[PDB]
Symmetry: C3
Subunit: 380 residues, 3 copies
């Protein structure tokens, strides 16, 4: 099993599109060796104005990033206090939010605004909370469409699998309602995302399932690092969003000015899926044998898998390059290979000299000539 013996990486695009009445779902192939190594599946949902991402659940945790847009979402946590007509908390999500969906939790999204919502979802197949297999699955409560990850295997909602009489007794409702339930009078094209007519009256007035399910890593959050001449990095870990300890997931959001770069570095204990949000960058990632397994442009809308411990560096080719990196641990640590608090920095001067065969003077240069932590401004 050398799933992670990756010789060549590629900036990846989705290889399937699934259009529905009120939007679109795009999938990256989970079978590609990059994703299998990473142990994740990647997808991107677009909700048109007044569209509903109908309730579904998955057998693994999801970390979702809101690339664009705002709206409402709900999660159904079995055994939680409610708020005739009772229900669980509907929260608002905002552009640049990271939303945590634990395993098996039903989740839905509504766009009550004019800007299309773009949500990019990481499904943590490798999670220990996934007790099935390494195929990503989605279970839809409703409709008559295939779930996006079916095509990658070798009525369609969960109600459609049961006898009508079972459903009649269990719900104590008429054959007509049951028919609606099982999506009988509905066709594949209506799909996972659906147009809403009168809008949806969702709002006011009024173990941790009362936990915070979402955190913003956009421009209004406190950055981990901000360099007026290079950019900003903000990470969300389980210290910021405690429910992340259950999902064992985290994320990093980054922005780079033109011709600035982030220093070579690696992830101690996590795979990274880097998804390009805006612009283009030159990335290089190297493996344990000094090989250059990736060396090229990553443009908005594409993903690059960076395996744990593989070193990576990026240089922006655009006025701004922004990305969101999904990491398969809740306390993802990076080791900086260059810069203020880097590996060389924290090595005794002399061992630095004996390690790379440099005069003492050159070793000090290697240590201190670069005064910045993670970001380095472009030059003249």
């Amino acid at each position: 099993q050398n799933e992670c013996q990756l010789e060549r990486l590629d900036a990846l695009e989705p290889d399937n599109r699934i259009e529905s009445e009120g939007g679109l779902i795009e999938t990256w192939n989970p079978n590609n060796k990059q994703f299998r190594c990473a142990g994740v599946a990647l997808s991107r949902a677009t909700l048109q104005r007044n569209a509903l991402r109908r309730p579904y659940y998955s057998n693994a945790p999801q970390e979702i990033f809101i690339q664009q847009g705002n709206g409402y979402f709900g999660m159904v946590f079995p055994g939680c206090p409610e708020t005739r007509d009772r229900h669980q908390k509907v929260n608002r999500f905002r552009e640049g939010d990271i939303i945590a969906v634990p395993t098996g939790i039903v989740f839905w999204m509504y766009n009550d605004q004019d800007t299309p919502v773009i949500a990019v979802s990481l499904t943590d197949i490798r999670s220990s909370n996934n007790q099935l297999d390494q195929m990503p699955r989605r279970f839809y409560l409703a409709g008559n469409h295939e779930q996006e990850f079916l095509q990658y295997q070798h009525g369609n909602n969960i109600f459609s699998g049961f006898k009508r009489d079972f459903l009649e007794d269990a719900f104590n409702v008429n054959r007509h309602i049951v028919d609606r339930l099982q999506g009988r009078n509905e066709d594949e094209e209506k799909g996972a995302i659906v147009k809403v007519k009168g809008g949806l009256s969702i709002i006011s007035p009024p173990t941790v399932c009362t936990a915070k399910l979402r955190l913003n890593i956009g421009p209004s959050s406190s950055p981990d690092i901000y360099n007026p001449e290079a950019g900003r990095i903000k990470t969300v870990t389980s210290l910021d969003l405690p429910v992340l300890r259950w999902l064992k997931l985290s994320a990093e959001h980054g922005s780079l000015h033109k011709n600035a770069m982030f220093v070579p570095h690696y992830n101690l204990n996590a795979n990274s899926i880097i998804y390009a949000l805006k612009g283009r960058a030159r990335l290089q990632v190297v493996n344990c044998n000094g090989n250059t397994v990736f060396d090229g442009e990553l443009e908005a809308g594409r993903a690059l898998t960076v395996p744990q411990n593989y070193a990576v560096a990026a240089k922006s080719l655009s006025d701004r390059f922004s990305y969101v990196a999904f990491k398969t641990n809740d306390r993802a640590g990076i080791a900086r290979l260059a810069g203020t608090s880097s590996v060389i920095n924290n090595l005794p001067l002399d061992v630095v000299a004996a390690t790379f065969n440099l005069q003492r003077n050159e070793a000090r240069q290697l240590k201190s000539n670069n005064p910045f932590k993670f970001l380095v401004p472009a030059r003249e």
Copy 2:
């Protein structure tokens, strides 16, 4: 792709092993359903004055006492005692006993009613650092272990007698008996104790036992449907280490439990009495099981797969083992349901119903999990 199951079956044991004092039945762990589940299932019957001789396993065990009453002991390395020995306990019908990974366990029946104990070995456990094959290690006898067939005879027999002579400081005859040398390999795991036994009834204070049968306080009770009792790490903290739990269920004729799925666990449904109709559906709306589950058979329900059941007997009862200590069910109908906790409007839009139709979906059944028979 071990869990891309397109056909479930109601499974019987495919092997029976008779011994002087009883019988052990095993279900095939290589069967695709149990491999998806990450578990193995076995059933032990102890006659009057039968001793289930001490054994251990490299994975957690959860044992349900289907019938009878008796005694059991466990040996926890480095634990204060109570001759001198560790605690011997009583078990009764409907008990769930938790045996942690590697702990030596023995059972005894001192009554006429045969003890019947069904065991779930949690191979997929993080505490199992071997492989996917169930293993049991017997301290004694000269019989093969129940699961060998799916891949002297005791651990002592594999050592030189000189090693054992020096380690125990005893003569060659004691070591010979220790090694099961002269024992006929039909005596087996469960042994008759000629005159019965000499009864005396990070934490060694842990409760190892808990009753989930009728005599206990239920979690759900409906007079014209049945009852549910579940044991989790909340009820029995030691379960926190096994990462296992269990639900005992009873259904009156024509009553049912609502469509539902388990969030975070695989389930093995074992039928205790009577018959039921079960359906389970996968992620694509396909019916992977649609048929009868009678007493003495098991049905695998994978995580996130939905299951529904309707009793065909005056009383249908089952124990469901689950591969998580805090297993959460998500109810698809009834009181505390997914549909219930969606706002009225999203329900309306989701299935395309009028508000009042949605209202009915969320309210026409006010019972939690059990649904009573009709008329």
Copy 3:
């Protein structure tokens, strides 16, 4: 699958040697069923006088035993306070030290004295912090040599083999703000494969003797330390767990150091919740290990320099044939638990006398002997 249905076990010397300028790295083949079952890799580094194990990191936890020699070592924990040039803390290590190296942490060693240092490393692949595959990997900051586990994989402008050599010079120049010359050195462009991971430090080195990264990273379990078990006629045992070295709780690793007088043995026993790698340090021993079918999967001599795997729940026993048999056993759990099959705190001792009688078909008085005749706990003296 059945990587642990082992019907035979081998006491193995390292499988391959890799010589460098200043020492030697010996690896056991991690594709041996034995190690695949255990979920670990085993290696042995030798540092000659004034030799430097150059900085490398791994995608899995390491537990390292100092078999021989004294020296310094250092780790680099991302985002940690410093000391003094400004660096992170460098510690001394002694014979018998267990050094805990967490996943991804850069680690280096220097032999500042004459006797060759010998450090044997358990790399814990089964770990959850390992998110790659079943293959041990090591990542070197410097040099132009292959990483020592590369030879066990069977499968672009590239020269050197270190992590910097894979980046283009401009990235490095920009990244470090240094000239073309320094960058070339970094990438090891002008160094040859034969120089290796362990380098001779010409003038000698210049260093002084001084998420919780302020934690203790080292603990001695050798002859200096206070024994958990001592028997004047049998030998001694010392173990380190997360209870001694709290950081072990992150690695899920522990280690047991043993030493037996001649003809002394340790009682048959099994590990509840850990696989063991027994590495022999001194003298020879007769070991037996039995599986779940009463079979002897190993039955011969374990002598200094060879490693043996005892899978979880397999019973093991040993009788020393040398004036002194000493060993270190690595176990895949920070809180390993053993069940002794014989001696005072034994599984048999904790069963009611009567079930013992009935279990083994013994008279009461014989069951009593089985409990009582051996007054010692784990070690037993020569009869």
